Homo-oligomer: A and B are copies of this chain.
Amino acid sequence: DRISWLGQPMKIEENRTYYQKVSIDEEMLEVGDCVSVIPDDSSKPLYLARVTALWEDKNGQMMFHAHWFCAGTDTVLGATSDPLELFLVGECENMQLSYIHSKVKVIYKAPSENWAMEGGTYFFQLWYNQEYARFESPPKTQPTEDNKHKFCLSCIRLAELRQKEMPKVLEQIEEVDGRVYCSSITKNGVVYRLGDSVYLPPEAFTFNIKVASPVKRPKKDPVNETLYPEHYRKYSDYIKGSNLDAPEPYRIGRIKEIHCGKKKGKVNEADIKLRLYKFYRPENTHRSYNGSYHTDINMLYWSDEEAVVNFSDVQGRCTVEYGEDLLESIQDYSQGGPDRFYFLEAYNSKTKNFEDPPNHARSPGNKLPKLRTLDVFSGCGGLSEGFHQAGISETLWAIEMWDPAAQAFRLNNPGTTVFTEDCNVLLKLVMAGEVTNSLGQRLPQKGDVEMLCGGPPCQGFSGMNRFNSKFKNSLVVSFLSYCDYYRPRFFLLENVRNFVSYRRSMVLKLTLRCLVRMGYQCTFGVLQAGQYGVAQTRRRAIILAAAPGEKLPLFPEPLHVFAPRACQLSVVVDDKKFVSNITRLSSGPFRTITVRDTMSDLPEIQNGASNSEIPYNGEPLSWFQRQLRGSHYQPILRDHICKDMSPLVAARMRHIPLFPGSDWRDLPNIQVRLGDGVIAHKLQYTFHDVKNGYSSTGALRGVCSCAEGKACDPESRQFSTLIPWCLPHTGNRHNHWAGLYGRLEWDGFFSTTVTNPEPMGKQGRVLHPEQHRVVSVRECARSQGFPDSYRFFGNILDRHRQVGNAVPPPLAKAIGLEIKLCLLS
């Protein structure tokens, strides 16, 4: 009703008079308390905030500053969240005291000094980021002196964010005829100087080298619908694993001069121009791709061509050095940091040759401790391998119930205690006070584990699972109980993409709630492994968590370009869209890793090879193979074996064309003489297909009675036919079974590597691009980014399962580097 100020006013500025206490409707109010307000526009029935300022405007009305809270229902947690728990957000607003409904009490529940040893009114514990779905510890910033009257952490976070984001000129040179020339500018926290190199989108500029793109021949020959009676199912014109729509990598340029204009006497820093020396990627020269197969992905070519771009198109800064001015070798300089490129020659666009670059392209002169990591569901160790490639963790403990995976883990990690028992039983032993198991292996205790990582079985969450038991018993909750008992400093959970949408995202919301209740900072996101150095589509949901005293890491920024079809990392929970902190959407610094860079160096083998150790018949033929085979001399190639297929499947694979996109739909309807007097029968079409109609020859396109709208007729099932009967049987409602008995293409990439490559499975494009066989164990590990020195164990099926279940070491390394960034500062 009536508003009356209490006490002496606080420091008054030009138009407002800050106060400390106030009385509304016989109540008392002080800065730091909380206030409820009734909404009129949002679907939410109530809003809660905290008072930070109590100024009185010169208009005569009484105002106050409210830093809003966020109910758990408004977060990604939703209805599962504790109704007494609130979260901090970067939302704040000025409002009159006439909208104050009541005064509520909100307390701060800080983690105990012995928080890591635990685990046997309204309140908030963490800050919530709505855009990235990030639960983080509240800032430690405090009101000092002058800001005590309007201290708003939301205003501070907002001012620092937009000031870091906006461009700013630091060092000016000279002003000539209305144009100011600069030498040092900055934006997004990045300092840009003259002589540095800069990432640009591919549409920033072109090259004087004319790239040719003539007509493609259209279906040069018509197809015989009697010989190939299932080709009409390829009308989609879509090729799985094709990099035709793959975007070009970042354009790189050399800043020579920076200039801009003026606005109202001062420099217009909002519109800064950059003039650059164009760099030539080996795929941009006259060689195009065909010459850039063996070259490094970070080797460029200097040019004296020039182009003018805007500073607003700058995506990032990269370090480009001349080859001979280096103080160390090329490999140590390339593997020493990110965004590092090098060049030894220069490219002339008109002469179409390679020279030595001028002297103005030359540069001036022209121990972190590893974390004790426990790896639950370690498998063969791909996740812990990537964590070791980041040099942030020694995996001391390992849990793996499957024996061959545990053996393969022991072969690659000699200093790891590998437990083969069940995770529930193993945790029950350490809860009972036991020191060692029956085998004498010491059990980790509280304080031993500094990081907990694992990838629970995704067979229940997989999109391919047909027969889709309760949460409190599912393995992901046992894996959470490990995090509750040991309370590590960092926590990582890996699963398939569909993990964030299983049962309307209930599993995700419950795992996040359990992390929030323990006091852990946490976040989630989806990452495509193909963006981090592998030639395979592998979207995986990652759940990160950090201790209250630590810093919550960010998600790794993509390093390689990839097909946009497989880069849909968005996640929708309860009508609210959430994305990771990734800022690179269109392009990236490095080109896409292809099948050619993944399998070209491996020798040619027949279907059913069993020699587990054969020699290399050549040297590495790409940067990817050079990274996996190492610089040391290693002539033995291990695990290059393919499954022995039946003569029927073998003949089917021999009749699959080598052209990209080919699959079972290109198979001919013929009879083939096999071993001895065995005969592969022909497929007979004796039923009408009401959906597909007749063919051009008038022949039918149905194989069963269900193609006529009737029920399935047993005894209509054909056996030992070249064209598999089951594929036209259920093809109409299964996307014509695209990819089955399909081939990879050299310029393309793998589909998601599974535990058993079979051409008649759901993901059935496992045929070699040239050879008449399925992919080998080594080719599967190559698609996963495993080093060739990595060992496996078991038979061919056991090793395939180890490769398929594993997290690609490139992706695990990308995550581990962002974890390393938190150990610093």
A residues adjacent to B (C-beta < 8 A): 40-41, 43-46, 71, 73, 78-84, 232, 235-237, 470, 472, 504, 506, 510, 513, 574-575, 689-696, 698, 701, 708-709
Given A45-B513, A46-B83, A79-B79, list of 9 further CB < 8 A pairs?
Answer: A43-B80, A44-B79, A45-B82, A73-B83, A78-B79, A232-B690, A232-B693, A235-B691, A236-B709
Q: Which residues of B contact A513 (CB under 8 A)?
A: 45
Contact A235 B45 (CB under 8 A): no
The smallest beta-carbon distance between A484 and chain B, in angstroms, is 15
The smallest beta-carbon distance between A358 and chain B, in angstroms, is 50
Tell which of B73, B510, B694 touches A693, judged by Cβ atoms closer than 8 Å: B694
A236 and B709 CA atoms in complex are apart in Å by 7
Contact B575 A709 (CB under 8 A): no
Q: Which residues of B contact A80 (CB under 8 A)?
A: 43-45
Contact B43 A709 (CB under 8 A): no
Given A693-B701, A694-B698, A698-B698, are A41 and B82 neighbors across the interface (CB < 8 Å)? no
Q: Which residues of B contact A693 (CB under 8 A)?
A: 232, 689, 692-695, 701
A431 and B804 CA atoms in complex are apart in Å by 71
The smallest beta-carbon distance between A79 and chain B, in angstroms, is 5
Closest to A43 in B: B80
Q: Which residues of B contact A574 (CB under 8 A)?
A: 79
A255 and B236 CA atoms in complex are apart in Å by 67
Given A695-B693, A701-B693, are A43 and B506 neighbors across the interface (CB < 8 Å)? yes
A201 and B22 CA atoms in complex are apart in Å by 72
Q: Which residues of B contact A79 (CB under 8 A)?
A: 43-44, 73, 78-79, 574
A701 and B71 CA atoms in complex are apart in Å by 57
Closest to A503 in B: B575
Tell which of B83, B237, B506, B690 touches A83, judged by Cβ atoms closer than 8 Å: B83
The 3 residue pairs across chains A and B that have the minimum distance between CB atoms? A693-B693, A235-B690, A694-B694
Residue among A41, A80, A236, A693 with max Cβ neighbours from chain B (10 Å)? A693
Taken together, the copies of this chain in the complex come to: 2
Q: Which residues of B contact A575 (CB under 8 A)?
A: 504
Closest to A235 in B: B690
The smallest beta-carbon distance between A415 and chain B, in angstroms, is 40
The smallest beta-carbon distance between A87 and chain B, in angstroms, is 15
A267 and B470 CA atoms in complex are apart in Å by 44
Residue among A44, A45, A691, A696 with max Cβ neighbours from chain B (10 Å)? A45
Contact B83 A45 (CB under 8 A): yes
Q: Which residues of B contact A695 (CB under 8 A)?
A: 693-694
The smallest beta-carbon distance between A605 and chain B, in angstroms, is 39
Q: Which residues of B contact A73 (CB under 8 A)?
A: 73, 79, 83
Q: Which residues of B contact A472 (CB under 8 A)?
A: 40-41
A46 and B41 CA atoms in complex are apart in Å by 29
Q: Which residues of B contact A44 (CB under 8 A)?
A: 79-80
Tell which of B81, B698, B709 touches A235, judged by Cβ atoms closer than 8 Å: B709
Residue among A40, A71, A73 with max Cβ neighbours from chain B (10 Å)? A73
Q: Which residues of B contact A237 (CB under 8 A)?
A: 709
Closest to A471 in B: B43
The smallest beta-carbon distance between A533 and chain B, in angstroms, is 35
The smallest beta-carbon distance between A699 and chain B, in angstroms, is 10
The smallest beta-carbon distance between A39 and chain B, in angstroms, is 11
A692 and B499 CA atoms in complex are apart in Å by 37
Closest to A694 in B: B694
Q: List 22 A-B contacts (CB under 8 A).
A: A43-B80, A43-B506, A44-B79, A44-B80, A45-B80, A45-B82, A45-B83, A71-B83, A78-B79, A232-B690, A232-B693, A235-B690, A235-B691, A691-B692, A692-B692, A693-B693, A693-B701, A694-B694, A694-B695, A694-B696, A694-B698, A696-B698
Residue among A79, A237, A701 with max Cβ neighbours from chain B (10 Å)? A79
A796 and B426 CA atoms in complex are apart in Å by 80
A79 and B80 CA atoms in complex are apart in Å by 11
Closest to A699 in B: B694
The smallest beta-carbon distance between A113 and chain B, in angstroms, is 24
The smallest beta-carbon distance between A69 and chain B, in angstroms, is 13
Q: Which residues of B contact A708 (CB under 8 A)?
A: 235
A701 and B693 CA atoms in complex are apart in Å by 9
Contact A45 B694 (CB under 8 A): no
Q: Which residues of B contact A689 (CB under 8 A)?
A: 693
Contact A43 B83 (CB under 8 A): no
A709 and B690 CA atoms in complex are apart in Å by 20
A694 and B83 CA atoms in complex are apart in Å by 62
Q: Which residues of B contact A82 (CB under 8 A)?
A: 45-46
Q: Which residues of B contact A690 (CB under 8 A)?
A: 232, 235
A709 and B232 CA atoms in complex are apart in Å by 12
A78 and B80 CA atoms in complex are apart in Å by 12
Q: Which residues of B contact A709 (CB under 8 A)?
A: 235-237
Q: Which residues of B contact A84 (CB under 8 A)?
A: 46
Q: Which residues of B contact A40 (CB under 8 A)?
A: 472
Closest to A575 in B: B504
Q: Which residues of B contact A510 (CB under 8 A)?
A: 43
Closest to A73 in B: B79
Closest to A696 in B: B694
A696 and B699 CA atoms in complex are apart in Å by 9
Q: Which residues of B contact A691 (CB under 8 A)?
A: 235, 691-692
Q: Which residues of B contact A506 (CB under 8 A)?
A: 43
The smallest beta-carbon distance between A49 and chain B, in angstroms, is 15
A690 and B696 CA atoms in complex are apart in Å by 11
Closest to A41 in B: B472
A237 and B709 CA atoms in complex are apart in Å by 9
Q: Which residues of B contact A701 (CB under 8 A)?
A: 693
The smallest beta-carbon distance between A602 and chain B, in angstroms, is 37
A510 and B45 CA atoms in complex are apart in Å by 10
Q: Which residues of B contact A46 (CB under 8 A)?
A: 82-84
Closest to A78 in B: B79
The smallest beta-carbon distance between A13 and chain B, in angstroms, is 36
A83 and B86 CA atoms in complex are apart in Å by 13
Contact B45 A81 (CB under 8 A): yes
A41 and B470 CA atoms in complex are apart in Å by 8
Closest to A690 in B: B235
Q: Which residues of B contact A235 (CB under 8 A)?
A: 690-691, 708-709
Closest to A506 in B: B43
Closest to A234 in B: B690
A78 and B83 CA atoms in complex are apart in Å by 13
Closest to A236 in B: B709
Q: Which residues of B contact A470 (CB under 8 A)?
A: 41
The smallest beta-carbon distance between A690 and chain B, in angstroms, is 4
A506 and B78 CA atoms in complex are apart in Å by 16
A658 and B44 CA atoms in complex are apart in Å by 56
The smallest beta-carbon distance between A452 and chain B, in angstroms, is 24
Q: Which residues of B contact A232 (CB under 8 A)?
A: 690, 693
A719 and B510 CA atoms in complex are apart in Å by 59
A504 and B83 CA atoms in complex are apart in Å by 22
